[PDB]
Amino acid sequence: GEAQRRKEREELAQQYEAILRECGHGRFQWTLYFVLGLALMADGVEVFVVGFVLPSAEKDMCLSDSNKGMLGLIVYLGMMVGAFLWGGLADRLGRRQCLLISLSVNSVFAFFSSFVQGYGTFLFCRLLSGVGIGGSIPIVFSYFSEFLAQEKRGEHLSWLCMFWMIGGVYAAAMAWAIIPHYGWSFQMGSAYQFHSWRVFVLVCAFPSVFAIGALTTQPESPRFFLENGKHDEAWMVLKQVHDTNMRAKGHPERVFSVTHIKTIHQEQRWGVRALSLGGQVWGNFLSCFGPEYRRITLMMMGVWFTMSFSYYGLTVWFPDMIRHLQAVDYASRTKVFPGERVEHVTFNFTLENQIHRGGQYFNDKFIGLRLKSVSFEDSLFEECYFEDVTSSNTFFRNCTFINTVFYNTDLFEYKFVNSRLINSTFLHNKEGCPLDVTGTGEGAYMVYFVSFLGTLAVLPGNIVSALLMDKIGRLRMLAGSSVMSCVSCFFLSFGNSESAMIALLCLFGGVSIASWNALDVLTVELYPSDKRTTAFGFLNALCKLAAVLGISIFTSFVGITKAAPILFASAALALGSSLALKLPETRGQVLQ
Amino acid sequence: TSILSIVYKKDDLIDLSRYGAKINIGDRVYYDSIDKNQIKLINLESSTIEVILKNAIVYNSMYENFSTSFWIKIPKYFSKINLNNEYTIINCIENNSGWKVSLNYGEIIWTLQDNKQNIQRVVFKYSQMVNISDYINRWIFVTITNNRLTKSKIYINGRLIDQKPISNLGNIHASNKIMFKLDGCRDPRRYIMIKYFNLFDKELNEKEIKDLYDSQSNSGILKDFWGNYLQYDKPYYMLNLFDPNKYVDVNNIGIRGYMYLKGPRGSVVTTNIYLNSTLYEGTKFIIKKYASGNEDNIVRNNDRVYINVVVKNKEYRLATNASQAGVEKILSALEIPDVGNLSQVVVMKSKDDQGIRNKCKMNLQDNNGNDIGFIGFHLYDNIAKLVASNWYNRQVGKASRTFGCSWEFIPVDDGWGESS
Numbered sequence A: 001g002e003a004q005r006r007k008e009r010e011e012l013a014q015q016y017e018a019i020l021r022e023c024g025h026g027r028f029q030w031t032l033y034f035v036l037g038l039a040l041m042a043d044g045v046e047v048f049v050v051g052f053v054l055p056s057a058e059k060d061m062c063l064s065d066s067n068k069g070m071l072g073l074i075v076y077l078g079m080m081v082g083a084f085l086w087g088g089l090a091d092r093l094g095r096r097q098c099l100l101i102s103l104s105v106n107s108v109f110a111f112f113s114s115f116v117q118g119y120g121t122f123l124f125c126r127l128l129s130g131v132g133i134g135g136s137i138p139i140v141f142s143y144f145s146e147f148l149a150q151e152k153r154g155e156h157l158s159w160l161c162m163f164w165m166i167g168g169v170y171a172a173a174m175a176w177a178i179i180p181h182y183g184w185s186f187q188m189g190s191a192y193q194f195h196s197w198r199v200f201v202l203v204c205a206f207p208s209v210f211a212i213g214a215l216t217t218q219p220e221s222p223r224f225f226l227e228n229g230k231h232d233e234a235w236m237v238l239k240q241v242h243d244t245n246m247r248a249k250g251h252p253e254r255v256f257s258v259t260h261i262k263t264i265h266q267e268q269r270w271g272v273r274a275l276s277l278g279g280q281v282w283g284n285f286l287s288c289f290g291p292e293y294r295r296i297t298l299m300m301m302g303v304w305f306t307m308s309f310s311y312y313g314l315t316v317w318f319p320d321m322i323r324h325l326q327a328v329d330y331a332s333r334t335k336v337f338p339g340e341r342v343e344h345v346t347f348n349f350t351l352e353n354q355i356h357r358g359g360q361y362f363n364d365k366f367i368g369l370r371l372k373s374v375s376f377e378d379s380l381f382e383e384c385y386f387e388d389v390t391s392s393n394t395f396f397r398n399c400t401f402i403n404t405v406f407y408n409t410d411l412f413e414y415k416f417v418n419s420r421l422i423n424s425t426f427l428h429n430k431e432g433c434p435l436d437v438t439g440t441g442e443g444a445y446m447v448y449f450v451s452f453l454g455t456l457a458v459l460p461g462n463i464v465s466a467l468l469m470d471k472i473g474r475l476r477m478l479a480g481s482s483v484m485s486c487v488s489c490f491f492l493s494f495g496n497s498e499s500a501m502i503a504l505l506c507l508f509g510g511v512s513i514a515s516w517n518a519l520d521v522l523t524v525e526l527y528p529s530d531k532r533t534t535a536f537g538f539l540n541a542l543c544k545l546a547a548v549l550g551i552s553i554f555t556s557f558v559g560i561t562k563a564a565p566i567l568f569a570s571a572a573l574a575l576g577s578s579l580a581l582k583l584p585e586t587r588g589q590v591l592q
Numbered sequence B: 001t002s003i004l005s006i007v008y009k010k011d012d013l014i015d016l017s018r019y020g021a022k023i024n025i026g027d028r029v030y031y032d033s034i035d036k037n038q039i040k041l042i043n044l045e046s047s048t049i050e051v052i053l054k055n056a057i058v059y060n061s062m063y064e065n066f067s068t069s070f071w072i073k074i075p076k077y078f079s080k081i082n083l084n085n086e087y088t089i090i091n092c093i094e095n096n097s098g099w100k101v102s103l104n105y106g107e108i109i110w111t112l113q114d115n116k117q118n119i120q121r122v123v124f125k126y127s128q129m130v131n132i133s134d135y136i137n138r139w140i141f142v143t144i145t146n147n148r149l150t151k152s153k154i155y156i157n158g159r160l161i162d163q164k165p166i167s168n169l170g171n172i173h174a175s176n177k178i179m180f181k182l183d184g185c186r187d188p189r190r191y192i193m194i195k196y197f198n199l200f201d202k203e204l205n206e207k208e209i210k211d212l213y214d215s216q217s218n219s220g221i222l223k224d225f226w227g228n229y230l231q232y233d234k235p236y237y238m239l240n241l242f243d244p245n246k247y248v249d250v251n252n253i254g255i256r257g258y259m260y261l262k263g264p265r266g267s268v269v270t271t272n273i274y275l276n277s278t279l280y281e282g283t284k285f286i287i288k289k290y291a292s293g294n295e296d297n298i299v300r301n302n303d304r305v306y307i308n309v310v311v312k313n314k315e316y317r318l319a320t321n322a323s324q325a326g327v328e329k330i331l332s333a334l335e336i337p338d339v340g341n342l343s344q345v346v347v348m349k350s351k352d353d354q355g356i357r358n359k360c361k362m363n364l365q366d367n368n369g370n371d372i373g374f375i376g377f378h379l380y381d382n383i384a385k386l387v388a389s390n391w392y393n394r395q396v397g398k399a400s401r402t403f404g405c406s407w408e409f410i411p412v413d414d415g416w417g418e419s420s
């Protein structure tokens, strides 16, 4: 019974390989490659948006802490949910169908977030956008694999990973080209403001829309039709493949010789379907953990979780360390002016990164001064007058104000730390957030640069992995890349400047990419065609959960010590490599 | 029912009751110029108000009931000197026995004493960290009812706040002389104002107390923010009670120009003492006579007057165009000699139709004596615009709650201390 089923499966797996070898590799495969490349480039774009718009959104929406942290993850949690959901539904509805639905969901919530004004609504919209783009990588790889013969399958599937780089580069370029124009203050509605970062959000939503447009012109995979008992549709799609390939070759006269194809025999109402769909998807998910796939699935779980944890941790750690080194340098350059007595003068200034201690100010007028990272400590202001005071990271500690007037100032209640005001008057206070919101200027440019260099270091690795996947093997590529990632993790000790961090980021990014390519190929090849997207979706959800855990842990260790990140990353990658070396070889086998 | 009642007369203070109580006044007790009946006491020894009763009206009985009533205006406490500084203002204690009235930081204290040195205290407390207070530097009608059988109660503005039993007390022998003087205050610049001090030989009920409250309130005369008489040719800052966090402002001058409620208000702060809201923000509203037959500068009920708005230290006029779209008429500030026939005469209202006392209402009227409506505010496209509409009169006729027809007039006072 079960053995009979398995025999039928293996028979279909050989005939389909024969049909694909007859069809040949050509124009159809490359067209589909570019279409699904757009789908994957959307995914590549999506993970940069909130990181690039947080410096502007924090001031424009009054974002506190624990509110810029849950927006730095929310995409990963959304992709966690989306990956599992759409990968599960792709084996009951179809790869192309579920890809269309997920991409549309991603695009819709993305344009909508481009306009949302609050934070909770923006968090929800961007979570749903993450849910929509989460099913792109499982579905895409499991969809492209069902059109490839075994001769060059690792190479053709590995070329498909250039697209995530092409999306990262796109995001960096558009952030550089759009966000720095802070002047743009388009006004539609008095209570609402439309800045440049929203324009960036829209332009980042665009590639998903293009992906939907491109995908609407491709056929469903014939293997999905064959598994589900639909024979005519699969025959039609295979004929289309053969016709396109042969027309492109230059011989549009030969005939598709396959006449009959082996097919797997199949043995209010809205809610009825909803239940049946749920039951079938759950059955597929548990059958992924069956006697035939329980060892394989568990090493896949280990490998995916360990690699994701290390990769995401270090990738979020490198820019944090760069900022921390910049902050340390900025604190080292601070000026201190101990003891002052200024009296009877109108005295503005544009002072940055200073500390005044022990001052005594009497009858002073402070008109039109900009304060950036200026602290007044142990000071006394008596019949003073502040007008048109712009304050950024400015505090008054242990200060005493007597008969002073704050006219047209942004000196809110949080800027006077353990102060004493006597007969003080606040008039015409400026509009601002209730709490400190910080401010990022020129650093944005260099941030973009860094991104551009961390998604370009990946390029040599992509090229080499794609070229050598078929010659060397998946296990050897995965192992040889995970080990060298571990060695790079050890090298993280010998860097304490920002340039060193940039070089180390480039090195680690260039090294880990081959491993991730190998793992994508391996997890496509290792599952039957009736569970490929359910399995690949579950293991890509596990990846996003590991991402969340690793990001949190590795940002918790910034400025404390370097030993914790090095040890965690090296341990995780060593365990991942050890588990990966225990996986079966799938090179030179039919796609069963 | 009154035994002692200090009132004003021709350059002297007398008693209205048929007892002719001797009154002695110190050489530094001051009086107001307009409401010279109310008296001010400063923190000096010579600021002495001395009243002597007769031997037949001395409180020396054992279940004799008594009550007192007065108005008090106590300024803002500015610094930390005033904290925990209970000082007596009214003393009627001889041989450590009698009744007394004392004050603390934001408190009014009623204390009565017996021959056995038993202390019973009733307290009213009012916050001073509030945005806009109904007690700080504003006249308060305080009366105390003492029932020797059950308990004593405190009443402010005709309402009860606190009450404590006094059944433990056996016999109270009050002094034959009542002392009105600040005693035990370390602040050299601290003063109070009291007026209309009366004595009763029976515990007053709520009905009689409310009757006295409205009788002494002078409902026929308009009262400013501080509770004093509202006066002609005196600049007043304007506060709308229903939206008290915005101040009257201008943007332009003319028919096209309009006046609106701009906010929010600022703050005056002395850390851990007071965090009030600035009351000296906006444009002043001077009131000029139009048809007042009275010689004095006191503004009374049903007086048709003009409104002068001080913009950039320049006087203008309040006028509207009666013939315009909608029911509410947008208020505008116009040049005094360029008003033409625009509706500018306003009727000032002190009490309702039934005679019930309420806040200040301005009833704009045309030259034909037609009621355009009470002056208020209506929101245009998220802007609070000063409007005059009949709708307020409609709610008044239907005995509903009007929204925006009540105003307060805030002059500059020394008891508030805000820097302008």
Ligand SMILES: *[C@@H]1O[C@H](CO[C@@H]2O[C@@H](C)[C@@H](O)[C@@H](O)[C@@H]2O)[C@@H](O[C@@H]2O[C@H](CO)[C@@H](O)[C@H](O)[C@H]2NC(C)=O)[C@H](O)[C@H]1NC(C)=O
Binding pocket: A403, A422, A423, B075, B078, B079, B189, B190, B191, B416, B417, B418, B419
């Ligand atoms: C806080 O101010 C009050 C009121 O003074 C006003 O506000 C000042 C900031 C300044 O602008 C003055 O010109 C204002 O008149 C002070 O209380 C009064 O102080 C004056 C002396 O300027 C004195 O003549 C009064 O008697 C004081 N009134 C009372 C009831 O004490 C107050 O002292 C100020 N706070 C401190 C710590 O000085």
Ligand SMILES: *[C@@H]1O[C@H](CO)[C@@H](O)[C@H](O)[C@H]1NC(C)=O
Binding pocket: A346, A348, A349, A367
């Ligand atoms: C403010 O400072 C500038 C120079 O930094 C000076 O020229 C100017 O006069 C100052 N402001 C006023 C109103 O004096």
Ligand SMILES: *[C@@H]1O[C@H](CO)[C@@H](O)[C@H](O)[C@H]1NC(C)=O
Binding pocket: A378, A379, A398, A400
């Ligand atoms: C600053 O130091 C302490 C508060 O930490 C305080 O005692 C001291 O008086 C302050 N300095 C001045 C000049 O007030």
